Design an enzyme around this catalytic site. Sequence first.
Site, short mmCIF file in Angstrom:
data_model
loop_
_atom_site.label_atom_id
_atom_site.label_comp_id
_atom_site.label_asym_id
_atom_site.label_seq_id
_atom_site.Cartn_x
_atom_site.Cartn_y
_atom_site.Cartn_z
CD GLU A 83 27.58 117.58 10.52
OE1 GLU A 83 28.65 117.96 9.98
OE2 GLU A 83 26.58 118.33 10.65
CB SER A 90 3.28 165.33 13.68
OG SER A 90 2.30 164.76 14.53
#
Length: 598
Positions: free
Chosen positions: A44, A304
């Site tokens: 880091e 549909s």
Amino acid sequence: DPIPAKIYDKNGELVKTLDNGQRHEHVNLKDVPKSMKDAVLATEDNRFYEHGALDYKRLFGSTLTQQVVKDAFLSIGRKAQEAYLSYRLEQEYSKDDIFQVYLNKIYYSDGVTGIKAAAKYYFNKDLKDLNLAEEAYLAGLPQVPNNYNIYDHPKAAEDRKNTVLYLMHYHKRITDKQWEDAKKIDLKANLVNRTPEERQNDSEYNSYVNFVKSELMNNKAFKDENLGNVLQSGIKIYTNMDKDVQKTLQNDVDNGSFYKNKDQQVGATILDSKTGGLVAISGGRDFKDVVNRNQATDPHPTGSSLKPFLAYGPAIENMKWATNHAIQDESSYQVDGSTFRNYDTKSHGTVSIYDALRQSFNIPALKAWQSVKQNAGNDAPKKFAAKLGLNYEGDIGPSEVLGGSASEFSPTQLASAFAAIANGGTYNNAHSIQKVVTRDGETIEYDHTSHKAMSDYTAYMLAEMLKGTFKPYGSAYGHGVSGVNMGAKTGTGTYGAETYSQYNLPDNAAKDVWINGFTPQYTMSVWMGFSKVKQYGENSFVGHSQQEYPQFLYENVMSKISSRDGEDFKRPSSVSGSIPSINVSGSQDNNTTNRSTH
């Protein structure tokens, strides 16, 4: 600084508060293994004790301090407020203080903050007795916690762990040997065994929470950030949720008897027809947030369901057809190098589109879609549908008209489209959040997309025709609520023609079944399907009888929650006549019938 998020219903009342996100064990810096700290730094901010607040060598030819700050309060220069706070913090606290805060407060995923708890969690180990590869991984994890979490991306998590090991060797924090030794360790070895359930560990809100979490980060003011970082900053979220409707919808979904087996799934959305506000949502039965796919917001084939938007809708809008407009039906029908037939395989001769819609004939809807394509332009259907949030990456063939192919949308999306019909033809993208109030006292206002999707007459005529779905011979006859004014459109979506054979599915086997109903008050959209297509139709809806299932859910809920005040859809002064014979004023229909179906 740490505090759970609070979710509030439509009345301001507290409904849920997101906890479970505190697997955090506090550690003092002396009690952290040298090798663990070496790992962190190497990956880091190696020269953390040296460079002071910012790392100027890094910048030219991040930093622990910066991380700690970025994590806490947090577009072009809001990175500078980080820089400044980092400076300040570097002026108030020593390097040990800062290093410790890092080890105690950074997020490690699955609701873990702090290396002390991050080890006890992933490996059930004390910091003392955990190995090198385990340290390397726990050191690299925090960078992007979601992509490095082993439980989710073991390949990435191993690559990350190896990168850290490399860094550690490169910064000569470990010998040439112990590097080689460590990249031989099985990382997964001591990996505590969990399923998606324990990883998380008043459920009627799960689906709604899941939905809010998604919409929350869509606002400009938060779009950049992270989940485990925006939910811990003690914000207050105010939603349109109806506490009662939400409970009803989820109970009825969990305890319903309309499930053929354990592989059947649901997705339900309930909007305020008028506003578009998400009143209640259910992602499935016994829906766990991250565990389960939220079926209310995932896309499924629509069957549909889309006829109102690709055929009859654009036809009534663009060429002002009457509801009893007449179409010639058939047994077969050609569109391209493909044949299409009705589900019942028959021809009903000449039919009013009022019936053709409320009973969902396929040929007449294809005709109508084709008539819209000629008399209004080939992009007329796309445009109409696109106003209602139903977008299409490419061409709209006869397949997507009948709900196949690219016609995949979420119940939430359809609910939005239908709510348009339900309210004069104004579209409202579904939206759960009203506003959020930050820890201090600021009020971010959320807004949603809204805009006319269709003219008043079109919406009223659709609303009136679709009422005919609950009338005899209608695809949802018997499932409407009594004193309540409602229209609906059902969807039944078949399987690919090849898959009918591969799995020996009966003729009447359906893969997706929908009902989309709307009252002046609520629009509700329900989808149902099975998680895996099985052999012989065991995981399919077979016959009206079985495909009728979502209509039980609809009817139950719509009956409990709909108010019987007799409100109706408002009739514009632009429509003339009465069902099944409604026309657009001063533009009556050349082509009509008084012919009924059955």
